[PDB]
Each structure stands twice: as C-alpha cells, then as structure tokens.
Amino acid sequence: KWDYDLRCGEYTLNLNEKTLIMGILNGSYNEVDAAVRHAKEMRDEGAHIIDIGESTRSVEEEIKRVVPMIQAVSKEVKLPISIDTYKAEVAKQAIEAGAHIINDIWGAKAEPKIAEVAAHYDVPIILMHNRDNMNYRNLMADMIADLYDSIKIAKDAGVRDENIILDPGIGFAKTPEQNLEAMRNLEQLNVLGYPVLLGTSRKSFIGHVLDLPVEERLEGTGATVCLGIEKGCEFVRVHDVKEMSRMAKMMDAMIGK
Amino acid sequence: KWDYDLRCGEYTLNLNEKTLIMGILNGSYNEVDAAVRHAKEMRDEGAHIIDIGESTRSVEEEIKRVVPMIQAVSKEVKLPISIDTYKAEVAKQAIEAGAHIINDIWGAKAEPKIAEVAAHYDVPIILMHNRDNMNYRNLMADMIADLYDSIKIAKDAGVRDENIILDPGIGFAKTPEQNLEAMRNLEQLNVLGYPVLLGTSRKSFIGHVLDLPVEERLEGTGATVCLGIEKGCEFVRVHDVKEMSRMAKMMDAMIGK
Ligand SMILES: Nc1nnc(N)c2[nH]cnc12
Numbered sequence: 001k002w003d004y005d006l007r008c009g010e011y012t013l014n015l016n017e018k019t020l021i022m023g024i025l026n027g028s029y030n031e032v033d034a035a036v037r038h039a040k041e042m043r044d045e046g047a048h049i050i051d052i053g054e055s056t057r058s059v060e061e062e063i064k065r066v067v068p069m070i071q072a073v074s075k076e077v078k079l080p081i082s083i084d085t086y087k088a089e090v091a092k093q094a095i096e097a098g099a100h101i102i103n104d105i106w107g108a109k110a111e112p113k114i115a116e117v118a119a120h121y122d123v124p125i126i127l128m129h130n131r132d133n134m135n136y137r138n139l140m141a142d143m144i145a146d147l148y149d150s151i152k153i154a155k156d157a158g159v160r161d162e163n164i165i166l167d168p169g170i171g172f173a174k175t176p177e178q179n180l181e182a183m184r185n186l187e188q189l190n191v192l193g194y195p196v197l198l199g200t201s202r203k204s205f206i207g208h209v210l211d212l213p214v215e216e217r218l219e220g221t222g223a224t225v226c227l228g229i230e231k232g233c234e235f236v237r238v239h240d241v242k243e244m245s246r247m248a249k250m251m252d253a254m255i256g257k
Numbered sequence: 258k259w260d261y262d263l264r265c266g267e268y269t270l271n272l273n274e275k276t277l278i279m280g281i282l283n284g285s286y287n288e289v290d291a292a293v294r295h296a297k298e299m300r301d302e303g304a305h306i307i308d309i310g311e312s313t314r315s316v317e318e319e320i321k322r323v324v325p326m327i328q329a330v331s332k333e334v335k336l337p338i339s340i341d342t343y344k345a346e347v348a349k350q351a352i353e354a355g356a357h358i359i360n361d362i363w364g365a366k367a368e369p370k371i372a373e374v375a376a377h378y379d380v381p382i383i384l385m386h387n388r389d390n391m392n393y394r395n396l397m398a399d400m401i402a403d404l405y406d407s408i409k410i411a412k413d414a415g416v417r418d419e420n421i422i423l424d425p426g427i428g429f430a431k432t433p434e435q436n437l438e439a440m441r442n443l444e445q446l447n448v449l450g451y452p453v454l455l456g457t458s459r460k461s462f463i464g465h466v467l468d469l470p471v472e473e474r475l476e477g478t479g480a481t482v483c484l485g486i487e488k489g490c491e492f493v494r495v496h497d498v499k500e501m502s503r504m505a506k507m508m509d510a511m512i513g514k
C-alpha cells in the first residue's frame with residue numbers, strides 16, 4: 001500500500017486501487033484538433049493521464065508546438081496532463097499553460113534547473129534513467145545508482161518525496177539484451193521506495209525480439225506491460241490504450257490490486 | 258532446465274527453448290475441411306500442437322465426431338495432435354486413429370481406465386484439476402492434493418513420470434475469485450515437478466473481471482498467458498494463436514528462456 005496520493009492540482013490519483021494508464025499523444029487549427037480528438041479518444045477507452053510530448057526517434061519551438069496543445073486538451077478532456085520535456089523553460093511554460101505532472105527523459109541530468117521548476121509548482125515529476133554513453137560495470141546496479149543521482153538532484157532542488165516517480169528508461173542507452181534484462185529485474189527499483197512508471201510502448205527491442213515493425217508491436221507491448229505490473233510498477237505509458245487498459249485490469253485482478 | 262524431452266511418436270517437443278503453444282480446435286466433408294483449414298492456419302501462425310476436442314460449455318458419437326478429424330489433420334498438418342476427452346474408449350480410438358498426447362479434463366478421476374490407455378501407448382497425458390463439487394478447506398493446498406491423486410492413478414496405471422503434464426484447471430469447479438487466486442499461486446504447482454499447461458483461453462472469469470463477451474477476451478487471455486509464463490508454466494492452450502504466440506515469445510525473451 002502507498003499511504004499517500006498523487007495530487008495533481010485538480011486531480012488525485014490513488015495508487016492502490018489500480019494500475020494507472022498514461023496515453024501517449026501523437027499552434028494551427030489542424031494539429032490542436034487531431035490532438036483534442038485523440039486525447040478524447042483515450043479518455044474514452046481507459047487512460048488516466050494524457051502525456052503531451054518532440055518525437056525523440058530549438059527551444060522557442062517546443063513552447064509554440066506544445067503550449068497550444070495543453071490549453072486545449074486540459075480545457076476539453078478532464079484528466080491530468082503530463083508534459084514530456086527535459087528543458088526547464090519548456091516545462092515552466094507547460095504547467096504555466098496547464099499541465100500537471102512532469103515527465104523528463106533526462107532524469108534532471110540534461111537540465112538541472114528543471115527540478116527546481118517541479119519544487120516550485122509542486123507537480124509530480126517522472127525521472128527516467130538515461131546516459132550520454134552506454135557501457136556498464138553492472139546494469140541494474142548502475143541504473144539504480146543513476147536514478148539515485150536524479151532523486152538527489154530533485155531533492156536538493158526542494159522536490160518533496162511524494163512527488164517523485166521513477167522510470168527505468170527501457171529503450172534508452174541500452175542494448176537490446178540490456179533492455180530485456182532490465183525487464184527481468186524491474187522489481188529491484190522497488191527498493192528505492194517510489195512509484196514506478198514503465199514505458200515500453202512499441203519500442204525497438206520488441207521489434208528486435210519479435211522481428212516486427214512499429215504497428216505490429218501491440219502483443220509485445222502487452223507482454224512488457226504485464227510482466228511490468230507483475231513486478232509491481234504503478235503506471236504504464238502506452239500508445240494503444242484500449243488494449244493495454246484491459247491487460248492492466250486483468251493483471252490487477254489476478255495479482256490482486 | 259528439464260533434462261528430458263516430450264517425445265510424441267514422430268515429434269519431439271524440447272521444453273527449454275520456448276513456451277509451447279496448444280491451438281484449440283473449433284465425419285462429413287464440411288466439418289473435416291473447416292478443421293484441416295483451421296489446423297493449417299494455426300500451424301501457420303505459431304502453434305506447436307493441435308488440440309482436437311465435445312464443447313463442454315453419448316460415447317459412440319465422440320468416436321464418430323473425432324476419429325475423422327484426427328485422420329485428416331495428422332495426415333495434413335505435420336504437428337503432434339492432442340485428443341481432449343475424458344473417456345477411455347474414446348482416447349483408445351484417437352491414438353489409434355493418430356493422435357499423440359492425451360488431454361483429460363477429469364484428471365483420471367471420471368474414468369480411471371484412461372490412464373492405462375496412456376501407459377499402454379506411451380503418450381503424454383495432461384491431467385487437469387477437477388471436482389464434482391467446489392467447496393475447499395484451502396484452494397491451493399486442496400488442488401495440489403487432488404492433482405496428486407491424479408498422478409497416483411496415472412502411476413499405479415504404469416504411466417512413466419516423463420509423460421505427465423499437469424494443468425491447474427482454471428475455469429472448473431471454481432468461483433470467479435477462486436480462479437483468480439489460483440492464478441496468483443500458479444508457482445506452487447511447480448513443486449510437484451512436472452511440466453504445467455495453463456488453459457485459460459477466453460474463459461468466463463475474464464468475462465467476469467473485464468465484463469466482456471467471449472470474442473472480446475483476447476487481452477484478458479493475454480494477461481493470464483503472461484502471468485502464466487512468468488510463474489513458469491510450460492504450455493498455454495489457446496484459441497487466438499497469432500496473438501498468443503507473440504506474447505509468449507515476448508515473455509520468453511524477457512524472463513530469458
Ligand atoms: N519517450 C518517452 N518519454 N517519456 C517517458 N517517461 C518514457 N518512458 C519510456 N519512453 C519514454
């Protein structure tokens with residue numbers, strides 16, 4: 001049991017009742033309208049949070065791209081919005097524009113000032129494992145270490161524990177077998193005592209294992225998400241929200257959550 | 258590691274390389290032809306064994322229904338065939354007609370003479386947990402006990418250990434929460450030291466949890482099959498073979514098998 005709640009301005013995410021789903025989102029009128037449509041579609045079929053992200057596969061632009069997105073969806077889909085950036089000034093504008101959770105693929109390493117931004121608005125922050133290189137003495141030990149330096153940065157910045165989520169960053173700075181192997185030892189991040197988000201939606205190593213292009217990776221995302229939840233993580237971040245919402249309630253039922 | 262092989266007349270199923278998939282099969286010309294088509298389709302998309310079954314949801318008929326089915330598919334799809342009966346004389350005819358594995362939903366309780374039939378042809382037998390009633394002092398303890406009486410019957414009948422597979426019989430003589438709870442403690446059957454088959458394909462308690470009719474239970478079958486494999490079982494028996502074959506290779510990759 002957690003004994004606290006994920007508070008997010010207007011919204012609250014109890015963390016015991018069920019595994020929380022994060023829907024990935026794919027300033028003119030056409031974009032802001034395919035996005036409100038799509039955010040709506042995700043609220044409709046199980047999502048618990050919308051993640052508005054650059055595709056990762058200039059600063060002034062990110063604001064311009066993303067601020068409009070948030071204004072609309074927050075005003076139109078009543079769910080907490082997470083902003084997927086690693087730039088501070090961007091994140092600044094986004095909560096400022098309406099978004100409630102941060103979500104940083106550089107776990108405060110790339111832009112330390114971001115963490116302060118969190119402390120400041122009291123917004124939960126996701127800290128993802130990542131590194132400019134990828135050679136490890138020992139994978140699991142080494143990523144638990146790294147994550148711990150993120151937390152350190154968060155904390156020295158003023159961020160309360162209760163606002164801290166970790167993510168093993170499956171997909172980044174990782175060989176295909178390395179990804180798999182983190183997958184096998186997900187349980188270990190548990191010992192740091194924070195809620196964990198898993199993010200594995202149609203990543204390349206599913207491709208690698210199954211031999212299958214992005215739009216054929218829905219069953220592999222499946223397997224990751226289950227073996228995820230059964231190693232006890234608190235959110236999954238995914239593209240295919242109808243299907244994952246259902247594998248989640250199933251796992252929940254079975255592992256009894 | 259197992260140190261033996263599942264030998265099946267002409268075919269051999271190594272049990273370490275991967276989780277083995279069992280495709281469920283759904284004497285005129287039309288039936289024997291929808292069945293060869295469908296058996297073929299399953300060989301094509303991942304199955305490792307075909308299971309030819311009465312739908313369970315007179316003796317002389319079962320032979321007549323099922324003997325033709327086997328003759329054709331064994332002659333046409335080159336894979337080992339399991340016959341899903343609990344009658345002895347039926348099973349008799351089926352291996353006799355060509356089928357290689359037995360598969361008994363009454364774990365030798367309903368018709369003890371069946372076990373002898375196995376000893377006799379040396380065909381691997383699946384023994385499923387089941388009971389004419391369903392009130393337990395203690396579920397897991399009680400089903401491990403029951404299974405143990407099946408094995409006893411098998412052994413006293415001459416059946417070699419290496420031909421013995423167990424199945425927790427999720428779906429039978431079980432309340433919805435009871436099913437779930439067996440699901441959570443699958444690992445326990447492991448201590449009896451035989452290969453386990455899980456059989457949960459679109460069963461009712463997925464319906465119960467997810468609230469969803471048989472043709473909408475593919476993601477829930479998913480969850481069962483993963484949490485299955487991650488609790489270490491050796492086959493899954495399923496309807497939707499494209500999709501499960503893929504969640505299986507994924508799990509395999511991740512748990513490293
Ligand atoms: N691309 C991503 N952005 N934010 C996250 N939190 C992720 N986890 C796994 N992949 C990602």
Ligand SMILES: Nc1nnc(N)c2[nH]cnc12
Binds near residue numbers: 361426
């Ligand atoms: N209906 C079934 N027949 N044979 C099996 N082995 C099963 N396991 C779960 N359901 C079944």
